[PDB]
């Protein structure tokens, strides 16, 4: 209600969320890799009933003139009137977009894949990536749902080989699919929800992140290479306060890292 | 490869799935996944319904990024005209409800997959509908002489000797929406799918009304 | 006299202007694209395809548009729109009276500089009506009230409004329900045909009044083929019609 | 957003005073407000001030593949934008009637004058041609636009600098280090806009109306005259009685003005060129930067810089250190059993 | 104990339904969709209905009491947000769309809206006649217990009412006027 | 507009086999096509239906016809709504029917295969013939969606594609020599059925469509094959009742469909230079 | 080119290009008109001073209101292009239309009334504007709505150091020396006026004069095409 402002926090003052969580709660984390056949690389991750599936299709193009032989990676973050009636009935939404790039900036802050490998014919051929992720049910950390929907959707991508014979392009489906998709770095993103006096919760919910007062997400490589930091105005802060987020974020990182690493031998081969 | 002159793939449906939308719907067809988020009644002398169509920007092998206004223009519209008689309108004078549906995948008949999935989010939501709207796929093999099929595959409907997809309301057998672009047969030769049509709905009419209660229950039993 | 809008009229003292005429830089011009008409000490123009704009107490039927909490707004072909308000109907009270879009007869109180035509009913001579027979005609296709207000021997009786609007109903058998039931297949052919019969006269830039519509009806004796092909038959229809009508005169 | 209101007397009297052939901002009927021009830090950048109306001019350099047909004369583009901050009523999207008419109207005389060569840019016709886009941003909005609007562009057009080092055969290479010299343009003709406002049956005529004037005027006309005392375009608007005859003075009068107006471009256009080659001072505008009040500029030092940088550990170590152990727990939480 | 809008149970010969009602030629089809419920009538027959999860339906009563929090304040007109038409109601459909006038802001006195109930506070009042001619409801604060109940200071304190026409915060000192 | 007091007769009247204008039940009206009136391109026709006017043009083009089907020729239909067409739909109102009919006429002729992908296929995989069939609507005489069925074909028999010879490049076009022209009666059409009770009609004034929730889409060729056919409405119908209307399609359509499909010659005969 | 007293089209640079017009065509509107400037075709329709329709909001009281839509046949031109995408011109064009009658039309006796006139180019061939101008003009003359004066627009091109009137299309292809105006012989006020060519400040009197007079003719021409339609419709 327009009233319960503190109510929600009542749990908070006595640290606890009406969700039954507290300072850090990687709730329901689930991924379905390659769940999309009609797509070379996909990953569906639903956390606390929010669904961002990363649907990746690959396409062949032509690396820029300036950037001669440079690969091609393209993302799109969309949200229809699905994930929440409280959404528009047309072109991209204010935030809808910010994320779009977020992943992208991440994609570019991450170095996940070197454009080098995307070029089909260094200088006249390139590999295009369309990693479109869509939140089926919106409610909480719409931000993380992607770092994962995407990170996993990629490992799910696999394509044949590249060949040019007498002014033609030869690549067959049943060709040689090697290095399908592998990134030397698998950083992930996490979202904390904060409250004025910095009493912050993690993996905010649709409502939790709502009456929030500050949002902050952090992406870090495996080796702990702070990909990018995001803070759409966070009431102000403390390096130390941030320090907690700093390290305690790492933790939820290993978890997901394992959450995915666990789909390696099981849901990957099953 | 080929199969029965009426075989059905596996029918999987769990609705209410959507926790954000009031009415939820989902589908499966060994290749199709169609989600439907419906929105209550709002004002914008007896209002009507709003429905929308979209196809995943990765629904296939190729990548259709922009919400193809033309593509969905018809797919959403006809869909609207189809599901359109299904709900009442007098309980929503000066009102309008919206229905949204996306096709993550196209298992040949994914067209009806939508006409179906949507139906769920409706009552799933619990609207003033009358009958349920049932749609299916029906194709005519490439066969020499008239070789006919019932509900094609993404691999199958592409080599069709004609193109059609039509729906109807079981219980009261009501012509939902019949849409096919003639290619083979005479005005009568079409009775082929038309009669082969009432089969499907009656057929799954239960398998459908069943998955609704399942959730309606899990929810009903929930609180 | 015939003159294109923007021209000049005989300028003298004691002269007044009409609609289609104006004074510009001490002269008189034709604003409207019409013909020159001088009656009495007033000048005016004749217009080809104008709009509705009657005088004194007037009779016309309207189709209904949206109605508001204090007045009902009806539609009538003219630079004017017709709106009647609860002051002659013999919050929800209105909703029961005059439904959504209906055909209603009316009495016209007055149209004031407020640029509008207002309505107040009284009888079935000014009542709400239903059936399904309306005629869309340039309101210039009218004559007078003296030869108006009539039912004619055609198997039905018709009324037309001082605008280009004519409704055809079947003779009463003595008030909303009166027609709620489907009239006989016999009453069905009298009016349905009258539909095609009335257009030609208009098509044939011809007037439309009792003894007028009568002969264009009478003329139906030969080509009785009720769905009268607009170009061919109608071409002839009026020929004979004026043939039987004009001979009544000279 | 906020509708800039408008009194009765204000308007009426504003006119009353025109009937007086007296300008409210107290000037004469065919004068311009003083107009200033500031040049950007970088080349191809400019700002105009028709005294209260402000425009932004930026030009672009590209090696695009010319169009189909005459694949022998590269293309160019220009855009005019109306800002929010422009006027209050300037919420992006609605004013089309201006952005329509004006953008196009303006853009008309550009391709009208063809004052811009289209083949000199063209390097490898049919293949790689140059694309020059120019953008106009209406910063503040006070009275007569299209004029500062034009100035803006023209004024801008002359300042931009296209790069070019060495392209032989079918190869293209350009280096900024060699670009330190070649970087000019094809400004053949220079046309400007002159608007004339009318008042009550154009029985009164104004030039370069201010905002307030802008409103009061019933109908307005524009004109385009290139240095060669000839027209390029004219436009009649606000519906008026424009006697072919009178239409004639304005036409004249417009020429009269375009005259001096040019002076400035060249004048300052020169003054600018001078500074780069002498002392040096690009920037946006130090003039507004030195004039007493509402503006200040100073440069300040950076060992306060490195002194605290070591404190990072203090907060980085004190906090996180104890914060890293919760990990041992997260290892097993949702990953181990999720195998379903 | 469930039904789908496509199955039939009884017919015009036994009962009529209020909930989940759908009828054609005499039989009973279920309009709604979700759950099935039957009815017992004081007439020797049953009424049939489907189950409306939203047992909470529009019930703001004509001249009834209500809980509401003010919105905009016109020193002449007062606006409000109502949430509880007593307590059973949680409904937010009518949300805050209600109006009251000074004359009815009390039964005696003559103190302006400005000195009764401010923009931010929650107030209590009973309901007056409603003329949905503009989608508004009339309410009164003309009671010895009625009026407003919420008090916030300039510092951010809560106020107690020091009198019949006052509220105050202990921290700073604000002698303010609010219809207690 | 849409009144009930009147909607009464409308429905009984059409069941009564007493339409409105001295018309029984399945009655049409003098409908003609003037072929070629756009002195600016191939195919051209102005079909005036009751009180509606439609116009369609066609022009030819070379090169790529697509990617997956290079060795052939396909058609492009662009459609327009005239602000003069709908006193209603103005600038952002054409989109409606304007996109729809663009698709309805796009699917019919798409699967119909009554398209000489052959008499339109220059250098297969390189050059192909492409004709743009464009539409405009100048009024609405009811059943207007059908007038497009005729103006869409009627303008096709006059598609005097130019006698063009390409020699690798080099182009040869004979303005006097107009023979590499393609026109066949394989061309599909539209037949609609909206119901006015149980007495369903085709080609009925708007006043009439006004009394119905749905209509049927049917398509037949010279004789009787079927192109895109669909059910169009906000209401519903009964399948048993579908096959009846359905056949009304091969049955009533070919009537004036045949009588018209002929008139293309009537203009071509009494005027090889008279017109 | 054009010379010896014979322009490229094959006509006196002072002699217009015969135009026939069918006004009062479709009778399902109120204002209807058809015309072609020699080989330039377009249809203009207006609907009487009906009370403010769609979007009940905006509604100028004191005087009527005006609306006008312009669009061209995708083939009406030489080749073919996108009409709802390359709007920039048309719309711009449309306004021009608007203004013109918006001036002369007499919205002074139609408070709140909303008169919408829409025009379409069927076959494009120079003087496009001037076409619809009258094309529209007639359209109204039909819908007989009162108006200050009867107005028509002409083109005037200056080539070979000479003044030509009604630069059809081919010449429109020239150096682009073309000017147009809408005019009310009534007193000869110049309603609208748009020239877009690089002419020197003095071929005006000439070119200006050119179109100026030119209209005056077009006027008398339609003056008849019109004086005729009144007497016959009088039957």
Curated annotation (Swiss-Prot), chain A:
Entry superkingdom: Eukaryota
InterPro entries from the UniProt entry: ExoRNase_PH_dom1 (IPR001247), ExoRNase_PH_dom2 (IPR015847), ExoRNase_PH_dom2_sf (IPR036345), Exosome_comp_Rrp42_subfam (IPR050590), PNPase/RNase_PH_dom_sf (IPR027408), Ribosomal_Su5_D2-typ_SF (IPR020568), Rrp43 (IPR033196)
Keyword list, A-Z: Acetylation, Cytoplasm, Disease variant, Exosome, Neurodegeneration, Nucleus, RNA-binding, rRNA processing
Keyword Acetylation: yes
Disease affiliated with this protein: Pontocerebellar hypoplasia 1C: A severe autosomal recessive neurodegenerative disease characterized by cerebellar and corpus callosum hypoplasia, abnormal myelination of the central nervous system, and spinal motor neuron disease. Affected individuals manifest failure to thrive, severe muscle weakness, spasticity and psychomotor retardation. Vision and hearing are impaired.
PANTHER family reported for this sequence: EXOSOME COMPLEX COMPONENT RRP43, EXOSOME COMPLEX EXONUCLEASE RIBOSOMAL RNA PROCESSING PROTEIN
Entry protein name: Exosome complex component RRP43
Organism: Homo sapiens (Human)
Curated annotation (Swiss-Prot), chain B:
Species in which this protein is naturally found: Homo sapiens
Protein name in UniProt: Exosome complex component MTR3
Chief place of localization: cytoplasm
Disulfide bonds: none
Gene Ontology cellular-component terms listed: cytoplasmic exosome (RNase complex); cytosol; exosome (RNase complex); nuclear exosome (RNase complex); nucleolar exosome (RNase complex); nucleolus; nucleoplasm; nucleus
InterPro entries linked to this entry: ExoRNase_PH_dom1, ExoRNase_PH_dom2_sf, PNPase/RNase_PH_dom_sf, Ribosomal_Su5_D2-typ_SF, RNase_PH
A molecular-function term among this protein's GO annotations: RNA binding
Family: Belongs to the RNase PH family.
The protein's role, per its UniProt record: Non-catalytic component of the RNA exosome complex which has 3'->5' exoribonuclease activity and participates in a multitude of cellular RNA processing and degradation events. In the nucleus, the RNA exosome complex is involved in proper maturation of stable RNA species such as rRNA, snRNA and snoRNA, in the elimination of RNA processing by-products and non-coding 'pervasive' transcripts, such as antisense RNA species and promoter-upstream transcripts (PROMPTs), and of mRNAs with processing defects, thereby limiting or excluding their export to the cytoplasm.
A biological process from GO: DNA deamination
Phylogenetic placement of the source organism: Eukaryota, Metazoa, Chordata, Craniata, Vertebrata
Coiled-coil residue spans: none
Keyword annotations: Cytoplasm, Exosome, Nucleus, RNA-binding, rRNA processing
Compartment annotation: Cytoplasm; Nucleus, Nucleolus; Nucleus
Superkingdom of origin: Eukaryota
Curated annotation (Swiss-Prot), chain C:
Family annotation (Gene3D superfamilies): 2.40.50.100, Nucleic acid-binding proteins
Main location per the UniProt record: cytoplasm
Subcellular location as annotated: Cytoplasm; Nucleus, Nucleolus; Nucleus
GO terms under cellular component: cytoplasm; cytoplasmic exosome (RNase complex); cytosol; exosome (RNase complex); nuclear exosome (RNase complex); nucleolar exosome (RNase complex); nucleolus; nucleoplasm
UniProt keyword Cytoplasm, yes or no: yes
Residue intervals of the S1 motif domain: 55-122
UniProt cross-references to SUPFAM superfamilies, sorted A to Z: Eukaryotic type KH-domain (KH-domain type I), Nucleic acid-binding proteins, Ribosomal L27 protein-like
Molecular functions per Gene Ontology: 3'-5'-RNA exonuclease activity; 7S RNA binding; RNA binding
Keywords noted in UniProt: Cytoplasm, Deafness, Disease variant, Dwarfism, Exosome, Nucleus, Phosphoprotein, Retinitis pigmentosa, RNA-binding, rRNA processing
Alphabetized InterPro entries for the sequence: Exosome_cplx_N_dom, Exosome_RNA_bind1/RRP40/RRP4, KH_dom_type_1, KH_dom_type_1_sf, NA-bd_OB-fold, RRP4_S1
Protein's GO biological process: CUT catabolic process; exonucleolytic trimming to generate mature 3'-end of 5.8S rRNA from tricistronic rRNA transcript (SSU-rRNA, 5.8S rRNA, LSU-rRNA); nuclear polyadenylation-dependent rRNA catabolic process; nuclear-transcribed mRNA catabolic process; poly(A)-dependent snoRNA 3'-end processing; positive regulation of cell growth; RNA catabolic process; RNA processing
Pfam families reported for this sequence: ECR1_N, KH_6, RRP4_S1
Family, as annotated: Belongs to the RRP4 family.
PANTHER family, per the entry: EXOSOME COMPLEX COMPONENT RRP4, PNAS-3 RELATED
Name of the protein this chain belongs to: Exosome complex component RRP4
Gene that this sequence comes from: EXOSC2
Swiss-Prot record, chain D:
Chief localisation class: cytoplasm
Keyword Lyase: no
Numbered residues of crosslink Glycyl lysine isopeptide (Lys-Gly) (interchain with G-Cter in SUMO2): 297
Single GO MF annotation: RNA polymerase II-specific DNA-binding transcription factor binding
Subcellular location: Cytoplasm; Nucleus; Nucleus, Nucleolus; Nucleus, Nucleoplasm
GO biological process: exonucleolytic trimming to generate mature 3'-end of 5.8S rRNA from tricistronic rRNA transcript (SSU-rRNA, 5.8S rRNA, LSU-rRNA); immune response; mRNA catabolic process; nuclear mRNA surveillance; nuclear polyadenylation-dependent rRNA catabolic process; nuclear-transcribed mRNA catabolic process; positive regulation of cell growth; positive regulation of transcription by RNA polymerase II
GO CC, alphabetical: cytoplasm; cytoplasmic exosome (RNase complex); cytosol; exosome (RNase complex); extracellular exosome; nuclear chromosome; nuclear exosome (RNase complex); nucleolar exosome (RNase complex)
List of residues that carry N6-acetyllysine: 297
Assembly mode: Component of the RNA exosome core complex (Exo-9), composed of EXOSC1, EXOSC2, EXOSC3, EXOSC4, EXOSC5, EXOSC6, EXOSC7, EXOSC8 and EXOSC9; within the complex interacts with EXOSC3, EXOSC4, EXOSC5 and DIS3. The catalytically inactive RNA exosome core complex (Exo-9) associates with the catalytic subunit EXOSC10/RRP6. Exo-9 may associate with DIS3 to form the nucleolar exosome complex, or DIS3L to form the cytoplasmic exosome complex.
Name used for this protein in its record: Exosome complex component RRP45
Organism of origin: Homo sapiens (Human)
Range of the intact protein held here: 1 to 302 of 439
């Amino acid at each position: 209600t327009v009233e319960p402002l503190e109510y929600y926090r009542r749990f908070l003052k006595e640290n606890c969320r009406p969700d039954g969580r507290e300072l850090g709660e990687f709730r329901t984390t689930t991924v379905n890799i390659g769940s999309i056949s009609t797509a070379d690389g996909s990953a569906l991750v639903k956390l606390g009933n929010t669904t961002v599936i990363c649907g990746v299709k690959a396409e062949f193009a032509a690396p820029s003139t300036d950037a001669p032989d440079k690969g091609y990676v393209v993302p799109n973050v969309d949200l229809p009137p699905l994930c929440s009636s409280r959404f528009r009935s047309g072109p991209p939404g204010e935030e809808a977009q910010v994320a779009s790039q977020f992943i992208a900036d991440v994609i570019e802050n991450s170095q996940i894949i070197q454009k080098e490998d995307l070029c089909i014919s260094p200088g006249k051929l390139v590999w295009v990536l369309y990693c479109d992720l869509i939140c089926l049910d919106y409610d909480g950390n719409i931000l993380d749902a992607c770092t994962f929907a995407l990170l996993a959707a990629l490992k799910n991508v696999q394509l044949p080989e590249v060949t040019i014979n007498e002014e033609t392009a030869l690549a067959e489906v049943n060709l040689k699919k090697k290095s399908y998709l592998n990134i030397r770095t698998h950083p992930v993103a996490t979202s904390f929800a904060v409250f004025d006096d910095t009493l912050l919760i993690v993996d905010p919910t649709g409502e939790e992140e709502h009456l929030a007062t500050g949002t902050l997400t952090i992406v870090m490589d495996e080796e702990g290479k702070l990909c990018c930091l995001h803070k759409p105005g966070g009431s102000g802060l403390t390096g130390a306060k941030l320090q907690d987020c700093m390290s305690r974020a790492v933790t939820r990182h290993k978890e997901v890292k394992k959450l995915m690493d666990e789909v390696i031998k099981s849901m990957k081969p099953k | 490869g080929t199969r029965d002159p009426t075989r059905l793939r596996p029918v999987y449906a769990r609705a209410g799935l959507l926790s954000q939308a009031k009415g939820s719907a989902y589908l499966e067809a060994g290749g199709t996944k169609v989600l439907c988020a419906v929105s209550g009644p709002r004002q914008a002398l007896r209002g009507r319904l709003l429905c929308d169509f979209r196809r995943a920007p990765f629904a296939g092998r190729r990548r259709r990024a922009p919400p193809g206004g033309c593509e969905e223009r018809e797919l959403a519209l006809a869909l609207q005209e189809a599901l359109e008689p299904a709900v009442r309108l007098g309980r929503y004078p000066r009102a309008q409800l919206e229905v949204s549906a996306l096709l993550l995948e196209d298992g040949g008949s994914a067209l009806a997959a939508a006409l179906t999935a949507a139906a769920l989010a409706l009552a799933d939501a619990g609207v003033e509908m009358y009958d349920l709207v049932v749609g299916c796929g029906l194709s005519l093999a490439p066969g020499p002489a008239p070789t006919w099929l019932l509900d094609p595959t993404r691999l199958e409907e592409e080599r069709a000797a004609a193109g059609l997809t039509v729906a109807l309301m079981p219980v009261l057998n009501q012509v939902a929406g019949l849409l096919g672009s003639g290619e083979g047969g005479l005005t009568e030769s079409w009775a082929e799918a038309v009669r082969l049509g009432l089969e499907g709905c009656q057929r799954l009419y239960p398998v459908l009304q069943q998955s609704l209660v399942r959730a309606a229950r899990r929810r009903g039993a929930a609180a | 006299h015939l003159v294109v809008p923007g021209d000049t009229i005989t300028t003298d003292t004691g002269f007044m202007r009409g609609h289609g005429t104006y004074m510009g830089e001490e002269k008189l011009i034709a604003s409207v694209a019409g013909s020159v008409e001088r009656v009495n000490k007033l000048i005016c123009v004749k217009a080809l395809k104008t709009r509705y704009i009657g005088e004194v107490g007037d009779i016309v039927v309207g189709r209904i548009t949206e109605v508001q909490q204090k007045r009902w707004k009806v539609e009538t072909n003219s630079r004017l729109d017709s709106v009647l308000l609860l002051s002659s109907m013999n919050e929800l009270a209105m909703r029961g009276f005059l439904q959504e879009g209906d055909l209603i007869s009316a009495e016209v109180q007055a149209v004031f500089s407020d640029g509008a035509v207002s309505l107040h009913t009284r009888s079935l001579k000014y009542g709400k009506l239903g059936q399904g027979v309306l005629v869309q005609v340039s309101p210039s296709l009218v004559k007078r009230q003296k030869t108006h207000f009539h039912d004619l021997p055609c198997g039905a009786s018709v009324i037309l409004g001082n605008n280009g609007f004519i409704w055809i109903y079947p003779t009463p058998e003595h008030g909303f329900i009166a027609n709620l039931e489907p009239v006989s297949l016999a009453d069905r052919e009298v009016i349905s045909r009258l539909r095609n019969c009335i257009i030609s006269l208009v098509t044939q830039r011809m007037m439309l009044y009792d003894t007028s519509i009568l002969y264009c009806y009478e003329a139906s004796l030969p080509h009785q083929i009720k769905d009268i092909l607009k170009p061919e038959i109608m071409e002839e229809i009026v020929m004979e019609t004026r043939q039987r009508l004009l001979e009544q005169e000279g | 957003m906020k509708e800039t209101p408008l009194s009765n007397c204000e308007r009426r009297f504003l006119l009353r005073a025109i009937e007086e052939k007296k300008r409210l901002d107290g000037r004469q009927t065919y004068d311009y407000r003083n107009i200033r021009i500031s040049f950007g830090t970088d080349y191809g950048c400019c700002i105009v001030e028709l005294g209260k109306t402000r425009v932004l001019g930026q030009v672009s350099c590209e090696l695009v593949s010319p169009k189909l047909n005459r694949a022998t004369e590269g293309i160019l583009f220009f855009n005019l934008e109306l800002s929010q901050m422009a006027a209050p009523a300037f919420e992006p999207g609605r004013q089309s009637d201006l952005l329509v008419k004006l953008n196009r109207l303006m853009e008309r005389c550009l391709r009208n004058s063809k004052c811009i060569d289209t083949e000199s840019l063209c390097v490898v016709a049919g293949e790689k041609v140059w694309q020059i886009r120019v953008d106009l941003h209406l910063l503040n909005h006070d009275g007569n636009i299209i004029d500062a609007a034009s100035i803006a562009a023209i004024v801008a057009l002359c300042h931009f600098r296209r790069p070019d080092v060495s392209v032989q055969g079918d190869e293209v290479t350009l280096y900024t280090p060699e670009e330190r010299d070649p970087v000019p343009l094809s400004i053949h003709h220079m046309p400007i806009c002159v608007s004339f406002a009318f008042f009550q049956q154009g029985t009164y005529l104004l030039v370069d109306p201010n905002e307030r004037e802008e409103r009061v005027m019933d109908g307005l006309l524009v004109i385009a005259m290139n240095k060669h005392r000839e027209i390029c375009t004219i436009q009649s608007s606000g519906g008026i009685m424009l006697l072919k005859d009178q239409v004639l003075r304005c036409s004249k009068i417009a020429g009269v003005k375009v005259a001096e107006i040019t002076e400035l471009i060249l004048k300052a256009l020169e003054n600018d060129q001078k500074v780069r080659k002498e002392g040096g001072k690009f920037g946006f505008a130090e003039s507004i930067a030195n004039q007493r009040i509402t503006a200040f500029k100073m440069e300040k030092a950076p060992x306060x810089x490195x002194x605290x940088x070591x404190x990072x550990x203090x907060x980085x170590x004190x906090x996180x250190x104890x914060x890293x152990x919760x990990x041992x727990x997260x290892x097993x939480x949702x990953x181990x059993x999720x195998x379903x | 104990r469930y039904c789908i809008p496509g199955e039939r149970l009884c017919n015009l010969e036994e009962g009529s339904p209020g909930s989940g009602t759908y009828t054609r030629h005499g039989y009973i089809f279920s309009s709604l969709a979700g759950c099935l419920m039957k009815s017992s009538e004081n007439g020797a027959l049953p009424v049939v209905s489907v189950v409306r999860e939203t047992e909470s339906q529009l019930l703001p009563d004509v001249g009834a009491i209500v809980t509401c929090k003010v919105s905009s304040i016109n020193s002449r007109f007062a606006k409000v947000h109502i949430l509880y038409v007593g307590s059973m109601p949680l409904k937010n459909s009518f949300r805050g769309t209600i109006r009251k006038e000074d004359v009815r802001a009390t039964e005696k006195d003559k103190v302006e809206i400005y000195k009764s109930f401010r923009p931010g506070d929650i107030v209590l009042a009973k309901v007056i006649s409603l003329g949905d001619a503009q989608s508004n409801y009339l309410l009164t604060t003309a009671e010895n217990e009625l009026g407003v109940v919420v008090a916030h200071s300039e510092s951010g304190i809560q106020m107690v009412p020091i009198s019949w026409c006052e509220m105050q915060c202990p921290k700073t000192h604000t002698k303010e006027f609010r219809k207690v | 507009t849409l009144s009930e007091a009147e909607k009464v007769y409308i429905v009984h009247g059409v069941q009564e086999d007493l339409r409105v204008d001295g018309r029984g039940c399945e009655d049409y009206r003098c409908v003609e096509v003037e072929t070629d009136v756009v002195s600016n391109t191939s195919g051209s026709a102005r079909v005036k239906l009751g009180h509606t006017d439609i116009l369609v043009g066609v022009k030819a083009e070379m090169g790529t016809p697509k990617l997956e089907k290079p060795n052939e020729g396909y058609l492009e239909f662009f459609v327009d709504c005239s602000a003069s067409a709908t006193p209603e739909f103005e600038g952002r109102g054409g989109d409606d029917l304007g996109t729809e009919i663009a698709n309805t006429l796009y699917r019919i002729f798409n699967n119909k295969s009554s398209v000489d992908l052959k008499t339109l296929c220059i250098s297969p995989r390189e050059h192909c013939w492409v004709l743009y069939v464009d539409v405009l609507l100048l009024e609405c005489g009811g059943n207007l969606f059908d007038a497009i069925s005729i103006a869409v074909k009627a303008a096709l028999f006059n598609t005097r594609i130019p006698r063009v010879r390409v020699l690798e490049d080099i182009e040869l076009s004979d303005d006097p020599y107009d023979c590499i022209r393609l026109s066949v009666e394989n061309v599909p059409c539209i037949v609609t059925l909206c119901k006015i009770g149980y007495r369903h009609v085709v080609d009925a004034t708007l006043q009439e469509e006004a009394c119905s929730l749905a209509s049927l889409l049917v398509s037949v060729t010279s004789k009787g094959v079927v192109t895109c056919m669909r059910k169009v409405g906000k209401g519903s119908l009964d399948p048993e009742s579908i096959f009846e209307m359905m056949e009304t399609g091969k049955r009533v359509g070919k009537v004036l469909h045949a009588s018209l499909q002929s008139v293309v010659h009537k203009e071509e005969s009494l005027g090889p230079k008279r017109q | 080119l054009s010379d010896q007293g014979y322009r490229v089209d094959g006509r006196r640079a002072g002699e217009l290009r015969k135009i026939q017009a069918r006004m009062g065509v479709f009778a399902q509107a109120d204002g209807s008109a058809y015309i072609e400037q020699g080989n330039t075709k377009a249809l203009a329709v207006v609907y009487g001073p009906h009370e403010i329709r769609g979007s009940r909001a905006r509604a100028l009281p004191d005087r009527a209101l005006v609306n006008c839509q312009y669009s061209s046949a995708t083939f009406s031109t030489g080749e073919r292009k996108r009409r709802p995408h390359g709007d920039r011109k048309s719309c711009e064009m449309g306004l021009q239309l608007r203004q013109t009658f918006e001036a002369a039309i007499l919205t002074q006796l139609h408070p709140r009334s909303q008169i919408d006139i829409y025009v379409q180019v069927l076959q494009a061939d120079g003087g496009t504007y001037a076409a619809c101008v009258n094309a529209a003009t007639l359209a109204v003359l039909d819908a007989g709505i009162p108006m200050r004066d009867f107005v028509c627009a002409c083109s005037a091109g200056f080539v070979d150091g000479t003044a030509l009137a009604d630069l059809s299309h081919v010449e429109e292809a020239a150096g682009g020396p073309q000017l147009a105006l809408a005019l009310l012989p009534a007193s000869g006020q110049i309603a609208l006026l748009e020239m877009d060519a690089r002419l020197h400040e003095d071929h005006l009197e000439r070119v200006l004069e050119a179109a100026a007079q030119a209209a005056r003719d077009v006027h008398t021409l339609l003056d008849r095409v019109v004086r005729q339609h009144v007497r016959e419709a009088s039957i």
